[PDB]
Amino acid sequence: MEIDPKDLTFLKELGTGQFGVVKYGKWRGQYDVAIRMIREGSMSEDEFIEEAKVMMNLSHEKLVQLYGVCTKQRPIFIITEYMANGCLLNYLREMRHRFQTQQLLEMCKDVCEAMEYLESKQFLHRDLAARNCLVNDQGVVKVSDFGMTRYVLDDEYTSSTGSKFPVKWASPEVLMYSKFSSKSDIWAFGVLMWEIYSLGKMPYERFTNSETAEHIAQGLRLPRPHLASERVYTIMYSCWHEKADERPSFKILLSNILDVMDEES
C-alpha cells in the first residue's frame, strides 16, 4: 500500500544494491524497515509499479515482507522488512568459522520453503542466488528481489549473452532458449545450496560465462563442498538435471531436506 514518507524515518545508510541505495529506518514507529530508492533510469516504472501491487499480496515467513511503496515521487521508495544481518552471500563469508553443518542445512530449508510458496503461487524468481537472500537478527534466511529482473531496461541484465546475465546460476534451457520456469529456479536453488555449503565461494569462479555455459551444457557440475555430506550433495545435484522435468519440485525438495535434517539428529 502507499506510504506517506511522513510516517518513515531515515536512520542509517546500508549501501547501494543492485537496484539503488538502501537505508535503515522505522515505519510507523514499530516496524524496522529497509527503504530502497529505485535507481532512476533502471526500471520500466509503470509496468513495475503496477506489478508491485501484485507482489504485495505475496506473504510468507521466509519472504522478505513488503510493507508498501512511495510512488507519487521519484525515486520510488520500497519499504521492506529489515534483515539486520544483510545479504546471505556476505553473511556467509564473514562468519565462515561460526557455522555447523546443522545451521547450513537450516539455511537451505529457509530458502526452499520460501521458494515452495512462490512455486505454489506460480510466481518465478528468475535470479535466485545468495546475493538476493537476506538474513535477519535471528539468523533466519529469507528470499527477496523475486521477479525484479522482468522490468530491467539494461539488455545486458536480461539477454542470455549479456555481460550482466547470471549465467553461473542459469539452467541450460535458460541459456539457450530463455525458457524460465520453476524448474529453472530449482537449478538456481541447487547453485545456491552450493554457495551456502561453500561459505560464499563464487561458483565456477575461474570460468568465463561462456566457458561456464558450454561446460554446463556438456555435463560439468559444481564440486561437492567440503562441509556437505554426500546426502546434502545428492540434493543439490538433483537440481542440476539437464532435463528440467527431471528436476524435483521445491515441495519434493523440501521433504528431502527435512529427511536429511532428521538424520542429522
Ligand X SMILES: Nc1ncnc2c1c(-c1ccc(C(=O)Nc3cc(C4CC4)ccn3)cc1)nn2[C@@H]1CCCN(C(=O)C2CC2)C1
Residue identified by cell 507519487 is 72
Question: What residues contact residue 67 under an 8 Å CB cut-off, 6+ apart?
Answer: 3, 27, 31, 33, 79, 80, 81
Are the CB atoms for 154 and 148 separated by under 8 Å? no
Q: Does 236 bind ligand X (CB under 6 A)?
A: no
CA distance 175 to 187: 12
The only residue of 14, 140, 220, 227 in contact with ligand X, by rule CB under 6 A? 14
For residue 123, give the nearest of 176, 185, 43 by alpha carbon: 185
Which 42-81 residues touch ligand X, going by CB under 6 A?
52, 55, 64, 66, 78, 80
The SS3 assignment for 214 reads helix
C-beta atoms surrounding 29 within 10 Å: 7
127 belongs to the catalytic site: yes
Please list the residues that pair with 27 across neighbouring strands.
8, 31
Q: Does 133 bind ligand X (CB under 6 A)?
A: no
Give the shortest CB-219-to-ligand X separation in angstroms.
34
Which 81-120 residues touch ligand X, going by CB under 6 A?
82-83, 86-87, 90
Give the shortest CB-189-to-ligand X separation in angstroms.
17
Q: Does 140 bind ligand X (CB under 6 A)?
A: no
**Interacting span for ligand X (CB under 6 A) from 15-23, 109-117, 215-223, 227-235:** 15-23
* List of residues contacting ligand X (CB under 6 A): 14-15, 17, 22, 34, 36, 52, 55, 64, 66, 78, 80, 82-83, 86-87, 90, 134, 144-146, 148
Catalytic residues: 127
